[PDB]
Design a protein around this ligand. Structure first.
Ligand SMILES: [Mg+2]
Ligand SMILES: [Zn+2]
Ligand SMILES: [Zn+2]
Ligand SMILES: [Zn+2]
Lengths: 102, 66, 45, 144, 97, 49, 44, 263, 48, 48
């Protein structure tokens, strides 16, 4: 076993110390039972991670381009590897040429 | 936190009826009947007693610092 | 020199600005200053 | 997170026009909507070298310079005010001195109370930080 | 600052020229500025917590200019549509009806 | 880059209605009135007050 | 039996909140990250 | 000319009918009971040592609202009327409270009965906290756990409800007149029928309802006022009524004396 | 207000606001005015 | 004529009652949940 770092712990999770011990011991160490957890403590400050909105990956989306552009329709997919669910590359397909143009 | 000494609107002393109200609720009496037996006629005192939250019972759970 | 109370075992002791910041009895690293003996007045309003 | 107040919808005296209300003064005197306000200040010593560190202490008039116009008598011998002491704005609650890098050569890094706020010293916390230097947190309580 | 002293008074944003006007001071206790109801409409303000700014002239020329050009009664009729901008509103309007 | 001056010729705060005020009157707190100041030159007429 | 009433739906919702809570998504995501994501990220 | 009829009379509240008086006199008398009747209330709190979970100002404010027996409050003097420095025995009442909880179990409830009158302007009958009975604990002041103690010294002074509501001797004063709306002092909101949609007053049986063929009496004025006065136990209802009348009389006499001296 | 402005002047027009407001406010104080839930209810015939 | 199956991470879902829809029994058109499930939930345990 070799130490490679310390990972912050979200309170009331499966690895937090307050998951067990019930209300009696929760009171015994200055912790409010009504607290719900779900936040980290960094340098004594309670920090919460806001959920981040993003578009879906590995799906095909087709859109109509604006009038002042040679492209009429664009079909695109943002391919991301399932392992880790990290975005890898963006690939697009464009229909060049407005109606009766080009 | 704890039962207020007096009704906010009128000013009737209602701080001495909390234990009696709880004991009356112990025998299964309805809240309206318990309030009536405490001679709380005006609804200002009724909302003073009925809607109170006894938060001090939580504050006494923590071990004292001295 | 100055009275202090432990944050865990709630034991009262004193410090003289030379001792390390720790409880004498249980070795806790969190201590509080004891309440002053001076009177405090309020207008009850 | 609130209270049940007896509300009347009326044009009484014209003093509640355009999003304003008239509060019963006697209800205020009986504790309606009264609250506590807690505010905490922090201070820690920092290390500049082998032994060049600050210290929590009561600054002197002669040996210590750069004295703020606020009072200093409320501090104790260790520079920390005892809990349960009435103070006003700009009063010194934490007294910290920093040596001058190469008598009357000590910067005063004292933290005064907010000039617009008053109250009583609710709690004082003394401890050590991660690296072992001193650490003080003073919580002030007032009534609104 | 004393009674009847002309002071400039403003709300942000100052979209129009009568969003800033000269008023006469009346010193009264407690910690809120007090205004007549009828001047709230030209200011486009309500008492839901809005804040207002106040300036004090520091010379006789500035005081005379405020009292003779930016006075509140002079701003009753606006040049935008040659009609008054202040009128009876709210409780007074309902009561007079 | 400039600093160092003492100017206190302005204020900003919350407002409320007052039916007992004239159209050209503004209510001012005593604290705000004390904070602000007006420089008046001493003459023979105003010297007493 | 009998038709399902509104208080039955409230019983169901009470059971839901008793089992899950209000911050279930954060705790579940962190737990699945700590239990499985770290090991697979190391083993990749 | 004025006449008084007492309907119900007990220790804490009195319901009565007041006749042959003007409306403004009755309203002023009610306001005098509500605001300008001097009583005794705690005004200075010195906290020697407090270990409870309640804030110092919290418990002090709760102590301020405790009613005190003010039967002989007239003989006492105001703080500004006394030449003694700070406060003395002739202008204040000194009470003390000392409570503690012993043992690792249970919770001790500190009530108003624990307050003890250390000193006062003897042999006046003031200062004692109001008790409903001899065995009644009274108002719940605080709650204490193990190793929690409270040691407070309080000073009670004479005041009026105008300064702060804690000297108010009355809680609510029910006041009404003209149950049948004969004088047409109010216009009744309704949807279909005004008579059916509005509950009858509790004094509707004390005055005969108007006949359908009756004409409006434009020269009539309000003459009978039904009022119920409830007290907090600091003063009995008859004492409150008499002292309100006396206070109004003293105010009018002071105005008369000022007018006479103005010449 | 426009007529008073054009006829008398800014001072009289300003004083008119205060006069009207004071009179109307006193009368409304001693008369009373309110709004309730029943003001938003129509009868059976209109609902039909 | 498409059949999609998603097992991704980050999808937002809500629970819903299941109404019986098989046209092979009298239960069609009715809620699958009965009073028995409510009784079991209130008890906190199944009847073995
Ligand atoms: Mg606004
Ligand atoms: Zn009440
Ligand atoms: Zn310890
Ligand atoms: Zn004295």
């Amino acid at each position: 076993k070799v130490h490679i770092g310390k990972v912050p712990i979200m309170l009331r999770s499966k690895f937090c110390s307050l998951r067990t011990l019930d209300e009696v011991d929760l009171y015994k160490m200055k912790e409010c039972p009504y607290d719900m957890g779900g936040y980290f403590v960094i340098n004594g400050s309670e920090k919460v991670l806001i959920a981040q909105e993003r578009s879906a990956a590995n799906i095909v989306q087709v859109f109509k381009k604006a009038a002042p552009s040679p492209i009429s329709h664009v079909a695109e997919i943002r391919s991301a590897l399932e392992k880790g669910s990290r975005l890898i590359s963006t690939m697009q397909i464009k229909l060049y040429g407005r109606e009766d143009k080009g | 936190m704890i039962i207020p000494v007096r009704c906010f609107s009128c000013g009737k002393v209602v701080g001495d009826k909390w234990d009696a109200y709880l004991r009356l609720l112990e025998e299964g009496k309805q809240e309206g009947d318990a309030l009536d037996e405490l001679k709380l006629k005006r609804y200002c005192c009724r909302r003073m007693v009925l809607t109170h939250v006894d938060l001090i019972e939580k504050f006494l759970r923590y071990n004292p610092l001295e | 020199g100055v009275k202090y109370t432990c944050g865990a075992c709630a034991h009262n002791f004193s410090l003289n600005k030379s001792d390390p910041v720790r409880c004498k009895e249980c070795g806790h690293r969190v201590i509080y200053k004891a309440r002053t003996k001076r009177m405090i007045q309020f207008d009850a309003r | 997170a609130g209270q049940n107040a007896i509300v009347a919808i009326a044009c009484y005296s014209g003093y509640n026009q355009e999003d304003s209300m008239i509060m019963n003064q006697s209800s205020i005197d009986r504790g309606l909507f009264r609250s506590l306000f807690f505010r905490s200040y922090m201070d820690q010593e920092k290390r500049f070298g082998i032994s060049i560190v600050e210290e929590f202490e009561k600054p002197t008039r002669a040996t210590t310079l750069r004295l703020k116009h606020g009072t200093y008598e409320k501090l104790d011998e260790d520079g920390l005010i005892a809990p349960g002491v009435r103070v006003s704005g700009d009063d010194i609650i934490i007294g910290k001195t920093t040596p001058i890098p190469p008598y009357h050569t000590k910067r005063d890094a004292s933290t005064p109370l907010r000039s617009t706020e008053n109250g009583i010293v609710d709690q004082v916390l003394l401890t050590t930080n991660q690296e072992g230097l001193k650490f003080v947190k003073v919580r002030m309580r007032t009534t609104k | 600052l004393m009674d009847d002293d002309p002071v400039l008074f403003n709300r942000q944003p100052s979209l129009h020229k009568m969003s800033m006007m000269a008023h006469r001071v009346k010193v009264m206790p407690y910690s809120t500025f007090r205004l007549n109801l009828s001047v709230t409409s030209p200011y486009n303000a309500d008492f839901d917590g809005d804040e207002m700014n106040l300036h004090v002239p520091q010379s006789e020329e500035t005081r005379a200019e405020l009292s003779q050009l930016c006075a509140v009664p002079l701003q009753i009729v606006s040049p935008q549509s040659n009609k008054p901008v202040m009128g009876i509103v709210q409780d007074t309007l309902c009561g007079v009806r | 880059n400039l600093m160092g001056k003492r100017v206190d010729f302005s204020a900003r705060t919350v407002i409320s209605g007052d039916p007992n005020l004239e159209l050209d009157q503004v209510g001012v707190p005593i604290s705000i009135a004390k904070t602000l100041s007006y420089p008046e030159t001493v003459t023979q007429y105003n010297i007493h007050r | 039996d009998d038709t399902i009433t509104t208080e039955d739906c409230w019983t169901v919702i009470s059971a839901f909140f008793e089992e899950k809570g209000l911050v279930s998504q954060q705790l579940d995501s962190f737990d699945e990250f700590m239990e499985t994501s770290i090991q697979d990220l190391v083993w990749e | 000319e004025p006449k008084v009829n007492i309907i119900n009379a007990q220790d804490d509240e009195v319901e009565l009918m007041l006749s042959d008086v003007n409306l403004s006199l009755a309203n002023s008398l009610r306001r005098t009971m509500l605001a300008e009747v001097p009583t005794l209330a705690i005004d200075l709190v010195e906290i020697k040592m407090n270990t409870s979970v309640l804030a110092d100002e919290f418990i002090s404010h709760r102590l301020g609202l405790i009613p005190l027996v003010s039967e002989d409050v007239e003989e006492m003097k105001y703080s500004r009327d006394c030449t003694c420095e700070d406060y003395c025995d002739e202008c204040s009442v000194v009470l003390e409270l000392s409570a503690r909880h012993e043992g690792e179990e249970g919770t001790t409830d500190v009530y108003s009965s624990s307050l003890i009158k250390v000193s006062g302007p003897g042999n006046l009958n003031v200062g004692e906290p109001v008790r409903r009975d001899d065995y009644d604990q009274g108002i719940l002041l605080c709650k204490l756990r193990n190793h929690q103690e409270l040691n407070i010294r309080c000073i009670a002074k004479k005041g009026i409800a105008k300064e702060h509501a804690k000297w108010s001797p009355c809680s609510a004063i029910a006041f009404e007149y003209d149950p049948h709306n004969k004088l047409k002092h109010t216009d009744f909101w309704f949807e279909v029928d005004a008579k059916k949609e509005w509950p009858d007053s509790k004094y509707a049986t004390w005055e005969e309802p108007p006949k359908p063929g009756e004409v409006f009496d434009y020269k009539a004025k309000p003459n009978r006022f039904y009022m119920t006065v409830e007290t907090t136990g600091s003063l009995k209802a008859n004492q409150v009524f008499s002292r309100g009348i006396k206070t109004l009389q003293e105010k009018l006499a002071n105005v008369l004396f000022e007018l006479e001296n103005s010449r | 207000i426009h007529t008073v402005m054009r006829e008398k002047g800014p001072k009289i027009c300003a004083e008119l606001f205060g006069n009207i407001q004071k009179v109307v406010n006193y009368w409304l104080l001693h008369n009373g005015f309110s709004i309730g839930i029943g003001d938003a209810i129509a009868d059976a015939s209109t609902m039909k | 004529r498409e059949f999609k199956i998603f097992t991704d991470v980050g999808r937002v879902y809500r629970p819903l009652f299941i109404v019986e829809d098989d046209e092979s029994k009298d239960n069609k058109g009715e809620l699958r949940i009965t009073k028995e499930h409510i009784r079991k939930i209130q008890q906190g345990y199944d009847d073995d």
